[PDB]
Design a protein around this ligand. Sequence first.
Ligand SMILES: [Cu+2]
Ligand SMILES: [Cu+2]
Lengths: 620, 620
Amino acid sequence: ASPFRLASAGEISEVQGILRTAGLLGPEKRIAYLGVLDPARGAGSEAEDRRFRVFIHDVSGARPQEVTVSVTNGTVISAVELDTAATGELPVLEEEFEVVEQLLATDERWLKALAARNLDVSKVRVAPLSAGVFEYAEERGRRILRGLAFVQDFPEDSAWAHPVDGLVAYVDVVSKEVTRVIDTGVFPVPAEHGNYTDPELTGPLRTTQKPISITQPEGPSFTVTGGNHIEWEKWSLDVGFDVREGVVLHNIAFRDGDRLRPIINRASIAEMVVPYGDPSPIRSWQNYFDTGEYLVGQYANSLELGCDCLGDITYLSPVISDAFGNPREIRNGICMHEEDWGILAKHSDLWSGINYTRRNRRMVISFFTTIGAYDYGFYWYLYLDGTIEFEAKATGVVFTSAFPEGGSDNISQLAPGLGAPFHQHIFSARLDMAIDGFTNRVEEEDVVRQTMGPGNERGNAFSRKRTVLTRESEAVREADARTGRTWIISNPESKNRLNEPVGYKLHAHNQPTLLADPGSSIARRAAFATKDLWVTRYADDERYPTGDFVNQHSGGAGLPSYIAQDRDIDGQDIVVWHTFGLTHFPRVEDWPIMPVDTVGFKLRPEGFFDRSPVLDVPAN
Amino acid sequence: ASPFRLASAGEISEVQGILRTAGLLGPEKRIAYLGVLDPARGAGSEAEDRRFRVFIHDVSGARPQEVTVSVTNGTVISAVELDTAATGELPVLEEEFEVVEQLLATDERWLKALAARNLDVSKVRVAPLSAGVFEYAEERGRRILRGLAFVQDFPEDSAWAHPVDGLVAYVDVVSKEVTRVIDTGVFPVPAEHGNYTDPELTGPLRTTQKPISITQPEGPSFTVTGGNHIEWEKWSLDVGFDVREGVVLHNIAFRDGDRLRPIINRASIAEMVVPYGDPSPIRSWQNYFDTGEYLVGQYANSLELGCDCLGDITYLSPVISDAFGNPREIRNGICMHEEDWGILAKHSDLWSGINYTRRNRRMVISFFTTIGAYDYGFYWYLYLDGTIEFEAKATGVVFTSAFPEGGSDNISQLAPGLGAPFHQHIFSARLDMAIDGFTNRVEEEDVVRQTMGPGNERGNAFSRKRTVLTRESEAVREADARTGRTWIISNPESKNRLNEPVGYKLHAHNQPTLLADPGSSIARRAAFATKDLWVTRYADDERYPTGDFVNQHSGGAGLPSYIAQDRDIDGQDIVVWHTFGLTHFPRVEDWPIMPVDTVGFKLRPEGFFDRSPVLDVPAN
Ligand SMILES: [Cu+2]
Ligand SMILES: [Cu+2]
C-alpha cells in the first residue's frame, strides 16, 4: 500500500512495455536512467499514480528523450526530445566503458604512442572518463569520453600501478571516432606492481586477530514492513533506492509520546564530484561527477555477511533497469542493522547517592558503490537521542599518474615513479526539511564574543546570535569554524513547552570546499561545491544541485539557477543542501589500496523535545 | 621490571614511610597530590630509580611542601617549602569539599539569606567550587572555596533541579571561616524535579530494545604483561595512571617488520578547564580546572561490566594515595578492549576481477570520572592502520541557575524558571612526540589555492604549503579550517623509501577556543586555551600547560612562560600541546540528565610507512 515502497521488478517490466509500445524503445535506444518519482505534495491522499521518469539515449545519433510514464495506468504522461548542447548530455552508459579502449586499439595515433613506449596494445586498459566542457567547439552537442591509459601485465594485475602519462585521447562514442590523441611526451611507466593479494607484497598474513562475535539472540529491535518501512526506537522512515542517488531516506519522523513528529521529508546524497588539481593537460579536465554523470546506485555492491556488514543484518535487494528496460536485482545491496554506541548518559551523584548509566545505540542504513578506482560507503545513522548523521567512507585505489622528475606541487609520490594527483571528493546532501511539518526556516548561529567592560566587568561573558535566512538570495552560506557556526532549521509555528520554536541543528565538519579558481569550468559546473550551505524553496523539479543532465553541461545549472529565483524561505517548505568533502593529498599509506577515510555531518535536536527523549531507556 | 609499571600499594606505603622518617609527614600533614615520575631521558644510565613527587598540605596553616622521594633508595631527593601566594595553592583536598556546607550551616548571614527564601538549611546543599583569582585581596595566600546553593527536597532528590540564585558564599577551608556572603536578591527556586529515575518523569520504560551481545570466544587479541604493557596488532605501549592526569599512555610504538618504531613517547590530557560565560556576580568567577585543581584521576569511577564497558574487557585497578599516604585502589578504573570498526579497505576492480574487503578494529583504553555535576569519559584509540585518536565524552547533569524573567544572552532555559549558564569544556593534550625517535620537527600544512593563468590555464590546480616551526617563539598556532590546516610532526633524519622524512599528521576538530576577553583572569590562567597548538622543547619540569599549582594561581607559569625561552624545536626533542573543546549552550534535551557529547583529535601516519601497513590483515 505505501506510495514510498521500492520499485518492483514488475513495475520496471511495465515501464519497458509502455515505452516499447509507444515506439520509444527501438533497437537503437538505451535507457540511461530510470527511476520512480516521489509522490507529489498534498497527496493528499489518494489515487496513487506510480510514475517513472526515464532518460533514453539513441546510439544512432537521433535526439535523446526524457519520458515520464504512469505504471498504474499504462500511459506515457510526457515525452520530450532533448537538445543536449543546451540542457546537457545523458549519463554515461555502462556499455560505453569498454568503447574507449576498443576505438583506440585500432587508431594509428594511439598505436604510435604505445609503440614509442613499447607497450603491447592488448595489455593497455583505458579508463572511460567524463569529458566536461573546455575549449573544444567541436564537442558541443556530441557525446564525448576521454581516455587515460593503464597497463595490465596479466589478467589479475592492478593496472593502477602502471599509468601511462603524457598521453590522452578523446572519443565520440556515438560516431565511433577518435577526435584527438594528445601525446605531450614519454614518461616512464611505473614498474612495481600494486597487487595487494600477492603474498610477496602482503608478507605472511597476521594470525593475531581473534574473532569478535556480534549477535542478537532475540533478533533486531527494528521492524521492517511493507518492504522498506522501518520502525526503530521511536523512529519511523522509509528506505528508498534510486539508481542515481543510491539509498534515499523518506519520511524521517520520531514518535514523541502520542504524536509522530516529522523531522526530514527526504534525505539523499544528491551529487558527489571528484575534481582533480593537476594542471597537466593530460588530467586538467578531469572532474568525475560520480552521482550526476555515472549514477552511483547502479554500481552498488552486493554486500557479504560477515565481511561487509557484521552482526544481525537485514538486507534490502533493490531492483533497477538495465539499458534495455529489463529489471535487475542488486542482491543484498542495502544493509540495515543496529549497533551499540557506547555510553548514552551517565552521572554518579554524591548528594542523591544515585549512580546512573545508560547505553546508546544507532540504526544504520548503508550501501557501498564502486566507480572505477573509487569505492564509497554511504552510511545513515539514527541515534536514540534524536541525532541523525551521515558518513561517507572513501576507499578503493588511488587514481594514479607518473611522478615527475624533480617533484610536483600538484601530485604526490606513492611508489617509485608513481604519482597521485591531488583531488577532492565533495558531496551534496539534499535535506528536504519537515521539522514538525513543512513550515520551516533556517537560522545561521554564530558564537559571539563579548568585550570586558560595563555589564561584563570580569570579561568572562560570551553569547551567540542567530540570523534568519529570509530569501534565497541571502541563503548561500559559508562555514566559520572559529565562531562555531551552525545552522538551525526550526518551525516558527510549533513551539516546545518553554514557548520556543522547535528546531534541529546542523553540525558540519568545516572541511575545505571546492578549491578550483572561481572562473574555472568546474567552479561553474559544480557551483554547489563552492559553499557549505544552501537553502531553497521546495520545487518538484529541483532535484540535483548540478541539474538534471550533468554530463558535458556548460555551467550554472542546478543550485545557482534555483537560488536566482529569490523565493521566500522564512516559514515555508524548504530544502537544505549541505556541501561537505575530503581534500586528498594522497599518502604512501594509501598505496596499493587505501584505508578508509571519512567525512559527514549530523543534525541534533535543538529544543525539539520538551526534555531528554531518552529518559525511558532501561538500564542495560 | 618495567620502569613504566603502575604504582603499587607497597610503593605508596613506602613513600609514606620515607616521608614520615624524614619528618615531613606528621599528623597535621595531608597528601594533596602523589604520583610516580617518569624515568629520566637516557636509561642506559643503569638500574631503576622509582621516584615519586608529592605535594604536602598542613592543616594547621603552616606552609606546604613539594617533595620528591626515591622509593627505590629510601631517600628524600628534594623538599621545598612553597609560598602559595606566589606560586599557587595546592590542589583541592577531597576532605575540604564538605567543609563549605558545614560552616555555612551556622553562619548568620547565610541563614538570613536562606530564611529570606523560605529554605530549610538542612535541605540546602552547597556545591564547593574552586575560587580562582579575582579582586579579593584577603584571599591571597589563603585556601578558599566558593559555594553555590541547591535545594534537595529529600535524600534521593537531584538538587541541580533547584538552584538558589542570587546567593554565593566564600569560605577559608583552613581557618574554617566564612569570609563573605553575597546576596544580590531572591530568585524563584525552580520547583520541577529532575529525578531521571522517577517513573513519573521517565514514563513506562521501553521494552523495545533487544540485546546486542558482543563476545570474543577465543579471548581478546591484545596481551597485557608486566601489569600494564599492551601489545596489540603491531602496537606496543604502557598504560599509566596519575591522580592528576588520569590515564597516561607511554612508549606508543608500532612494529613495522623487524623494527619497533616509536611514535609518541607520552600522551596525556594535561589540563582541562570549564569556563562559565554568565556575567552575573553569582557565577562570573566560575572556572574549574578539573585536572589541575581537582585531580581527575582521583575521582575515577569503578566501571561495571555490561553497562560501562561492553564486550571482552580487561580491567586495570590503579592505586593512588589517600590524604594520609595510605594506598587506595580504584577497582576497575580502566577498561581495555578491542572493538570492531567497520570496513578498513575495500575495492572491487573491473579490470582484474578481484573483489577485496577487509575489516577494521581499534584498541580502546578508557576511564570515566565524576566531579560534582559533571562526568567525563576519556578514550584513547589505536587503529590497525596506524591512526591514534583521543575522544572525550561529556555527560552528567547541567550546572544550573535561575532563568531570568526577561530572558538572557548568557543562559538558556531548561525547564520553567530553570537556567543553564553558557560555558565551555576545554582540554589540553600533551603529546611528547617521538616520531621514529626523538629528533622531531613540526610543520603547519595549509591548502594553497592557485589563480587561473599561465601554468594553470583551466584554473583547476591546487596545492599545499608546509611551514617549519623552528623556534618556540613561532610555535603558538591557531586553527584555519577553511584552508584545511593541519600540523605534521616529522623526523628529518628518518626517511621513508621514497626519501621523504617520516611523519604523522594531527587533525584537529577546529572547535572554538577560549572565548573570554583576553584581559580576563581566566584568559591569563588558562592562556593555553586561547590557541589551538603549541610546541615546546622537552623539559623535565614542564608538565602542565597551567604549571604545577593552578588553584588560586594567577598568570605567570605554564606555557606562556615556557615558550619565552625561545628554544630550538627544528629537529629536537619536542612536545605538542593541542587545545580542543566544546562550547555548550545547553538545550532542553540536556535536562534532566545530558546525553553524551564528544570532542577530540587524531593523528594519522603521513609517509611514516613505505606503503599501507595493513596489507597483511586477513579476510574476515
Ligand atoms: Cu581521494
Ligand atoms: Cu557543558
